[PDB]
């Protein structure tokens, strides 16, 4: 019984998308007490798919160069965002995170060959893109505003997991699929 | 009878260790309580200069360095016996410093 | 005219040690360490050229290379020619320049 931060269970999450089953690592072997470990995940290719998804969300929050290397801060903002999520929704924050990853990932992109022909998206790359979109949505929502990064992260991936269009990641996913459909 | 301390300093390990071996072996042959080679941290003296004599090029640097190794030997014996333990074919790059229980 | 509350004639009477408390920290440090023979000879020449001028005209100009000589209150009224590197610019010492050096009255550029 390994609980994230000591209080969030991990065996009742459900990755409802078969494609992302082996890239969103959250259960049975990937359970951990903290989103912090001496990684060595960028050593070989695909090894970062064996990283816990909360540690990827933590890693992708140390950004813009004034927050580079500050991982303890991102660990506590992830902890506080998870507490805010459990207050607002009423369900396991890991489930909400996993659903936000699944809904916020683009599944058809458009690459520059020339005009931009449409292309399909790898599962690992759409997990990468989902994480990056949620992180930058939270980051740009908390900049020059009285809300804090925990509440912005919480409301960002809550609106993502529910599927509404008031999140930033859903807007970007829709825009990417819209261009990659109008430009097949 | 004193606490005689021999300090050996050199810039190369081979001759220094072989002089230490000679001193320890000679002292063991004449039944001395020899507190053996203590190895002090090697000092690395580093000077990094510009390679060029003028001031033009690709700004490359030259990293010269020189190591200094230090060894200690502690004897507990009269002076005249250490006066024959030492003075047996000291290698050139080695420098000894006897300290006879006082400055 | 007053300088840190005290009038000119009292400034003339007081010694260097009392004068140090009425200066900035730079001039107090410069007077703490001695004045060398160059500045003493400049003071001699300024005194000599002031005590030989007829009444109601300025004293004869005293040229000098010393741009780092602080202006004592026994230098006011006297006329100095300060070198700026090329020429001797004429400076009439007025009582307001007690704190400042002679150097910042002969500009060295254009």
């Amino acid at each position: 019984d390994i609980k994230l931060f000591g209080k969030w269970s991990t065996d009742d999450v459900q990755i409802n998308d078969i494609s992302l089953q082996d890239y969103i690592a959250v259960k049975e072997k990937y359970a951990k007490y903290l989103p912090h470990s001496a990684g060595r995940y960028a050593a070989k290719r695909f090894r970062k798919a064996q990283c816990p998804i909360v540690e990827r969300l933590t890693n992708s929050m140390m950004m813009h160069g004034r927050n580079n290397g500050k991982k303890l801060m991102t660990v506590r903002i992830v902890k506080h965002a998870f507490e805010i999520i459990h207050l607002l929704t009423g369900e396991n924050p890991l489930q909400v995170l996993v659903n936000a990853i699944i809904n916020s990932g683009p599944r058809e992109d458009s690459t520059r060959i020339g005009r931009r022909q449409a292309v399909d998206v790898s599962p690992l790359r759409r997990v990468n893109q989902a994480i990056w979109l949620l992180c930058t949505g939270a980051r740009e929502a908390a900049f020059r505003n009285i809300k804090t990064i925990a509440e912005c992260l919480a409301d960002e991936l809550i609106n993502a997991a529910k599927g509404s269009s008031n999140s930033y990641a859903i807007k970007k996913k829709d825009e990417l699929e819209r261009v990659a459909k109008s430009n097949r | 009878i004193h606490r005689i301390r021999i300090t050996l300093t050199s810039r190369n390990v081979k001759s220094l260790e072989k002089v230490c071996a000679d001193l320890i072996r000679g002292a063991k042959e004449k039944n001395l309580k020899v507190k053996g080679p203590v190895r002090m941290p090697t000092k690395t003296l580093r000077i990094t200069t510009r390679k060029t004599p003028c001031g033009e090029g690709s700004k490359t640097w030259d990293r010269f360095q020189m190591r200094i190794h230090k060894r200690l030997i502690d004897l507990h014996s009269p002076s005249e016996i250490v006066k024959q333990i030492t003075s047996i074919s000291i290698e050139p790059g080695v420098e000894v410093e006897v300290t006879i229980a006082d400055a | 005219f007053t300088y840190r509350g005290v009038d000119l004639d009292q400034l003339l009477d007081m010694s260097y040690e009392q004068l140090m408390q009425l200066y900035s920290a730079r001039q107090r440090r410069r007077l703490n360490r001695g004045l060398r023979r160059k500045q003493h000879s400049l003071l001699k020449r300024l005194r000599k050229a002031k005590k030989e001028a007829p009444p109601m005209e300025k004293p004869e100009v005293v040229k000098t290379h010393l741009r780092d000589m602080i202006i004592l209150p026994e230098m006011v009224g006297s006329m100095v020619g300060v070198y700026n590197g090329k020429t001797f610019n004429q400076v009439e010492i007025k009582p307001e320049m007690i704190g400042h050096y002679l150097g910042e009255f002969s500009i060295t550029y254009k």
Binding site: - | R11, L45, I47, T49, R50, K51, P53, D62, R63, F64, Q65, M66 | -
Partner: protein, 50 residues
């Protein structure tokens, strides 16, 4: 003549090989120009290991 004080500064110190005052290395008590050091380094004992 030699009246000006030369107790500190670049004027006080010169190379012990060429008496040049620029690029002087004073570390460890060398007092040698950078170029003269680069020439006599192997003789002094400064090998280039890395």
């Amino acid at each position: 003549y030699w009246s000006h004080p030369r107790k500190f500064g670049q004027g006080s110190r010169s190379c012990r090989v060429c008496s040049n005052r620029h690029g002087l290395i004073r570390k460890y008590g060398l007092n040698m120009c950078r170029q003269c050091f680069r020439q006599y380094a192997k003789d002094i004992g400064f090998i280039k290991l890395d």
